[PDB]
């Protein structure tokens, strides 16, 4: 799979989600202080990951991602 | 048999029931030709100077056999249009409400328990 495919599909479903403010969607785009989200909203983002680009994501690892660089890297070596 | 003038133990999460009051709620009218109500009849009821339609859920005189008999006159409030005032019903409700002709489907969505 194309690694930039992982990049713009993680980035893409981060753009598909509606409650977030697409202001600082970096690779260090954090959730609680960068975008101001609860952990419920964080697993809501995990729900916004597994729906298109995911389906194998474990709960111990989805608890502590917190930035889409770690997401792209983790699905990158996960596949 | 819940006739006129009978004291009534309201089982609801309603504002009218669980509010304290100096008069016990008591029946005024029974909506049958004879003035005797059984499990699954509508009555008027005096709560806090407010008459209010109500539905009899179990009484103290014995009915048929396999049906239950309560130690109070449990009654669920209802509005004029037919939807109940209450939100939860704690005391168990007999399943004998299911067969009778009238508004019972609305109340059986509310029961915690079934006897």
């Amino acid at each position: 799979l194309t690694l930039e495919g992982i990049q713009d599909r993680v980035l893409y479903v981060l753009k598909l989600y509606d409650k977030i403010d697409p202001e600082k969607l970096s690779v260090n785009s954090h959730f609680m202080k960068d975008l101001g989200l609860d952990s419920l909203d964080q697993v809501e983002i995990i729900m916004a990951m597994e729906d298109e680009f995911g389906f194998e994501i474990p709960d111990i690892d989805a608890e502590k991602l917190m930035c889409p660089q770690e997401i792209v890297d983790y699905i990158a070596d996960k596949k | 048999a819940i006739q006129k003038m009978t004291r009534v133990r309201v089982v609801d999460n309603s504002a009218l029931g669980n509010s304290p009051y100096h008069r016990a709620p008591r029946c005024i009218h029974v909506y049958k030709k004879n003035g005797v109500g059984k499990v699954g009849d509508q009555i008027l009821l005096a709560i806090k100077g407010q008459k209010k339609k109500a539905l009899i859920v179990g009484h103290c005189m014995p009915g048929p056999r396999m049906t239950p008999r309560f130690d109070s006159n449990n009654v669920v409030l209802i509005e004029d249009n037919g939807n109940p005032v209450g939100t939860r019903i704690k005391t168990p409700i007999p399943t004998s409400l299911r067969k009778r002709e009238g508004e019972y489907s609305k109340v059986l969505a509310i029961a915690q328990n079934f006897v």
Binding site: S39, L40, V43, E44, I46, M47, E50, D59, A62, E63 | -
Partner: protein, 69 residues
């Protein structure tokens, strides 16, 4: 203040994993109802009520009192 840390989000994501195994109903009203069970309830509560509401979350997960299809 809840039962633990990981258990709450674990039951959350578990209810979502049943949320995709949902078959017959409008799954977005379902998910919004999961929100309204979790957003407006799990903010600013005492540590005892956290326990009871995560226990009704447990029972709502297991579904021996009925399951949403």
């Amino acid at each position: 203040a809840p039962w633990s840390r990981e258990a709450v989000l674990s039951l959350y994501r578990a209810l979502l994993r049943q949320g995709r195994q949902l078959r017959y109903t409008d799954r977005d009203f379902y998910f919004a109802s999961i929100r309204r069970e979790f957003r407006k309830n799990q903010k600013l509560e005492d540590a005892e009520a956290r326990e009871r509401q995560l226990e009704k979350g447990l029972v709502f997960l297991n579904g021996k009192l009925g399951r949403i299809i």
